[PDB]
Amino acid sequence: MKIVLVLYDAGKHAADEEKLYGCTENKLGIANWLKDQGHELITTSDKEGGNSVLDQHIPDADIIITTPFHPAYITKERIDKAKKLKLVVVAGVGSDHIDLDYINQTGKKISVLEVTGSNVVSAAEHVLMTMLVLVRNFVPAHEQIINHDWEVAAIAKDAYDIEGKTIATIGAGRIGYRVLERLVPFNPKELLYYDYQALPKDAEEKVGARRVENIEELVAQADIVTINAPLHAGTKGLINKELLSKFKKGAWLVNTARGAICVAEDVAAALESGQLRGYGGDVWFPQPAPKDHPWRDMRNKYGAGNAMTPHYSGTTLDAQTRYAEGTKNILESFFTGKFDYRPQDIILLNGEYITKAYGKH
Amino acid sequence: MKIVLVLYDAGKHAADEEKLYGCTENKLGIANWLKDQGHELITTSDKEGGNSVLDQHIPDADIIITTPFHPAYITKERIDKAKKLKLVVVAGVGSDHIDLDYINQTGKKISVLEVTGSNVVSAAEHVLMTMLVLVRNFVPAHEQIINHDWEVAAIAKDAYDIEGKTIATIGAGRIGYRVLERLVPFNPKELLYYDYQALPKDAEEKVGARRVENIEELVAQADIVTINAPLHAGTKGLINKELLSKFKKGAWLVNTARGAICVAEDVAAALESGQLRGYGGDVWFPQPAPKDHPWRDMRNKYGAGNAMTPHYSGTTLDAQTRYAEGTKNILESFFTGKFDYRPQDIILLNGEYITKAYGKH
Numbered sequence: 159m160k161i162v163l164v165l166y167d168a169g170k171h172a173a174d175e176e177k178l179y180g181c182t183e184n185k186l187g188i189a190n191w192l193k194d195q196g197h198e199l200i201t202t203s204d205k206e207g208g209n210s211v212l213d214q215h216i217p218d219a220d221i222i223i224t225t226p227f228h229p230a231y232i233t234k235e236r237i238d239k240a241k242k243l244k245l246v247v248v249a250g251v252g253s254d255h256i257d258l259d260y261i262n263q264t265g266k267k268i269s270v271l272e273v274t275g276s277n278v279v280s281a282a283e284h285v286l287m288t289m290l291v292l293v294r295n296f297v298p299a300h301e302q303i304i305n306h307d308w309e310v311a312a313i314a315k316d317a318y319d320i321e322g323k324t325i326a327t328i329g330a331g332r333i334g335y336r337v338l339e340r341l342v343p344f345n346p347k348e349l350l351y352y353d354y355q356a357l358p359k360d361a362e363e364k365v366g367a368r369r370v371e372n373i374e375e376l377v378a379q380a381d382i383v384t385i386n387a388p389l390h391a392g393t394k395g396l397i398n399k400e401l402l403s404k405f406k407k408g409a410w411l412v413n414t415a416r417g418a419i420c421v422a423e424d425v426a427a428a429l430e431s432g433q434l435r436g437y438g439g440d441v442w443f444p445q446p447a448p449k450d451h452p453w454r455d456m457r458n459k460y461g462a463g464n465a466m467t468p469h470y471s472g473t474t475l476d477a478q479t480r481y482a483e484g485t486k487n488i489l490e491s492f493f494t495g496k497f498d499y500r501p502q503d504i505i506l507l508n509g510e511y512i513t514k515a516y517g518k519h
Numbered sequence: 520m521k522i523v524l525v526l527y528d529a530g531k532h533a534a535d536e537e538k539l540y541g542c543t544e545n546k547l548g549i550a551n552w553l554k555d556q557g558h559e560l561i562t563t564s565d566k567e568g569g570n571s572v573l574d575q576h577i578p579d580a581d582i583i584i585t586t587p588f589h590p591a592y593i594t595k596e597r598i599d600k601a602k603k604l605k606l607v608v609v610a611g612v613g614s615d616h617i618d619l620d621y622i623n624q625t626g627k628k629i630s631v632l633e634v635t636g637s638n639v640v641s642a643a644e645h646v647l648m649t650m651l652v653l654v655r656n657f658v659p660a661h662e663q664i665i666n667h668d669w670e671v672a673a674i675a676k677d678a679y680d681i682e683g684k685t686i687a688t689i690g691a692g693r694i695g696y697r698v699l700e701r702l703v704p705f706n707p708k709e710l711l712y713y714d715y716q717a718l719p720k721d722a723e724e725k726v727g728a729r730r731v732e733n734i735e736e737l738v739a740q741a742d743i744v745t746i747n748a749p750l751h752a753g754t755k756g757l758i759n760k761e762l763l764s765k766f767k768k769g770a771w772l773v774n775t776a777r778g779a780i781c782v783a784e785d786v787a788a789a790l791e792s793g794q795l796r797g798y799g800g801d802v803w804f805p806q807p808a809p810k811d812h813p814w815r816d817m818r819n820k821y822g823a824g825n826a827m828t829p830h831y832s833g834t835t836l837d838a839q840t841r842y843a844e845g846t847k848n849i850l851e852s853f854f855t856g857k858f859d860y861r862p863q864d865i866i867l868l869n870g871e872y873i874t875k876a877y878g879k880h
């Protein structure tokens with residue numbers, strides 16, 4: 159089989175860390191196995207533009223392996239040229255960089271598999287971290303130190319404890335629930351969730367969560383909102399000017415899910431106006447994020463409220479070994495012709511939606 | 520009575536935030552209350568140098584109110600000139616900026632009171648935040664974004680999950696235990712503590728903590744060490760070159776307790792050499808931290824591993840009102856002649872140690 163593998167380049171950083179499997183230099187650590195299995199592997203980070211290495215090899219690729227942190231956008235146009243494509247794998251979690259609805263609506267026999275659960279803890283930790291960083295005003299505090307300054311009041315004037323705050327998640331799946339679990343001992347005033355899929359009642363009671371039926375009522379009462387749903391037609395552009403106007407004034411918003419769930423300029427405008435006190439996360443649309451993407455320079459009125467990072471929470475070294483192993487397992491399920499995929503890894507099976515988490519079908 | 524109140528100045532920031540009780544402008548909310556009682560209140564941030572406002576008023580001050588974030592150093596030289604001093608109050612937690620041993624060992628009839636518990640949650644949150652920021656390599660990740668760069672591998676090469684790490688606290692009192700409670704749902708490999716005061720078995724079991732009686736055995740097995748003990752003769756310089764040499768190579772160290780529990784240059788050398796991967800916290804010796812303090816510029820080999828802030832974790836807006844009210848209550852106990860202090864607030868009672876947490880007596 160011909161396999162095209164699109165990952166980020168590590169460049170000079172590859173020499174620093176042998177456990178960085180998720181880059182083009184190291185090929186998920188599965189290259190020896192793929193070679194022994196008799197497959198052809200094209201590895202590249204070159205994923206944009208008509209004569210990219212990606213586009214050169216799409217026409218006869220049997221399998222494309224992608225990774226969300228450097229996502230090959232498998233558009234309708236690319237799908238139409240992909241005459242041999244049978245399987246797209248996501249080394250990570252989240253398959254929205256592939257035009258899933260086009261595959262599904264046309265009935266093309268392409269399966270889309272991701273390594274469910276591989277980095278959900280990693281993302282949940284990043285959520286907790288970003289909530290604390292924003293609420294406690296950490297970014298300007300650190301900036302003050304490295305700029306050789308000292309003025310406690312300049313930080314304290316917009317620093318709070320997370321204790322006593324009302325916290326809402328949009329999406330209460332693997333990440334959203336793990337976020338709620340980690341928040342319990344911080345003594346929030348209340349933990350809330352909005353999801354068309356209810357939590358199991360035992361899980362709900364374990365974290366003291368209350369389900370809120372509609373998203374406007376959810377955000378209106380939340381000091382802190384976190385986005386933990388996949389990107390699909392029902393969440394694309396969900397966080398927009400109108401919905402932001404219904405947030406509690408001065409709320410903190412965290413998004414480690416997908417950038418395009420938010421309207422980028424509407425989040426920036428809400429931060430600059432004080433509708434939000436802070437915004438942070440690791441995910442952007444598109445990725446790599448352009449140098450002038452508005453989320454880089456946006457700040458609140460105090461010059462703070464920005465806890466953005468590149469997309470890496472799901473590619474910590476601990477997560478990388480897990481999604482590398484899961485990618486191998488998915489590939490083996492395909493190669494053997496058993497197609498004995500783990501049920502939870504299946505986004506599309508030969509064009510059909512198996513997941514329930516990407517909207518109702 | 521004459522009361523000298525030493526707080527940080529908020530300056531222009533006072534106009535931004537009415538809840539900033541802990542600055543010289545707002546005087547803990549007690550200025551008019553003291554005035555209506557006939558007391559004279561001198562308020563200042565000028566606390567260094569022989570003709571500081573503090574030193575001008577020390578000779579006839581009946582009461583000195585301090586705060587850890589901008590600490591008046593009530594040294595033995597100042598005590599010797601403080602001929603009317605009867606009470607030192609700490610608007611906050613931690614009394615080490617007063618020479619407690621000098622008071623006790625030379626029979627000075629001075630009580631020292633602090634607002635125990637008023638910001639222990641705030642500090643515990645800051646510990647959790649700093650652990651996450653360091654382990655997950657957040658600081659350089661955010662720096663990359665605001666420098667208009669994008670390179671996932673430059674961050675991921677030294678990014679981990681906190682899950683699966685072994686975490687040790689030196690000091691398992693109000694903050695240390697609250698840190699352990701917050702870490703439980705993060706699924707650490709193990710939680711450990713070292714403290715001459717044992718936790719009750721039920722308290723140990725609640726957090727799955729294991730007591731280690733030897734400090735070298737404790738640090739040798741810890742991926743993450745957190746300092747949560749007061750500064751006293753038994754902890755001053757505890758974290759020195761020899762102990763750091765027994766830390767697990769590449770450990771992360773968090774200190775929201777007091778700067779001088781660490782030998783400053785020993786910490787910096789361990790970070791620059793890789794014995795530590797990261798250091799962070801909000802506390803310094805002395806405070807305000809000099810512009811040249813080595814904890815400002817120290818970095819690991821990758822230019823990161825520094826999560827320092829100014830001393831503010833215990834002066835969030837949620838904390839300030841708690842320790843302001845508690846300061847008023849301590850003052851009232853003194854003014855009425857009842858001396859009905861909360862027992863947990865008493866560090867020294869007319870020179871005698873009441874606390875057990877500042878070493879054995």
Ligand SMILES: NC(=O)c1ccc[n+]([C@@H]2O[C@H](COP(=O)([O-])OP(=O)(O)OC[C@H]3O[C@@H](n4cnc5c(N)ncnc54)[C@H](O)[C@@H]3O)[C@@H](O)[C@H]2O)c1
Binds near residue numbers: 330386389392415
């Ligand atoms: N930043 C990272 O590195 C990283 C890592 C992993 C996952 N993610 C992203 O997070 C997303 C969630 O991951 P997960 O493991 O929790 O997935 P999951 O499938 O377990 O949970 C997703 C939840 O979102 C719910 N949902 C779908 N549409 C919704 C809507 N309109 N409103 C409210 N809830 C809705 C679903 O019903 C489900 O319960 C992924 O799809 C991925 O995009 C990012």
Ligand SMILES: NC(=O)c1ccc[n+]([C@@H]2O[C@H](COP(=O)([O-])OP(=O)(O)OC[C@H]3O[C@@H](n4cnc5c(N)ncnc54)[C@H](O)[C@@H]3O)[C@@H](O)[C@H]2O)c1
Binds near residue numbers: 612613714777830878
């Ligand atoms: N960064 C901040 O804003 C902030 C806020 C509050 C407190 N603090 C500092 O944290 C310290 C602890 O606060 P707390 O509320 O947990 O106090 P606490 O009295 O409840 O607990 C302190 C613990 O440290 C133990 N201890 C004393 N010496 C020790 C030693 N050599 N080795 C190990 N353990 C030792 C004590 O036995 C006790 O259990 C305060 O004294 C203060 O210096 C900082």
Ligand SMILES: [Cl-]
Binds near residue numbers: 392393517518
């Ligand atoms: Cl939906």
Ligand SMILES: [Cl-]
Binds near residue numbers: 878
């Ligand atoms: Cl001791």
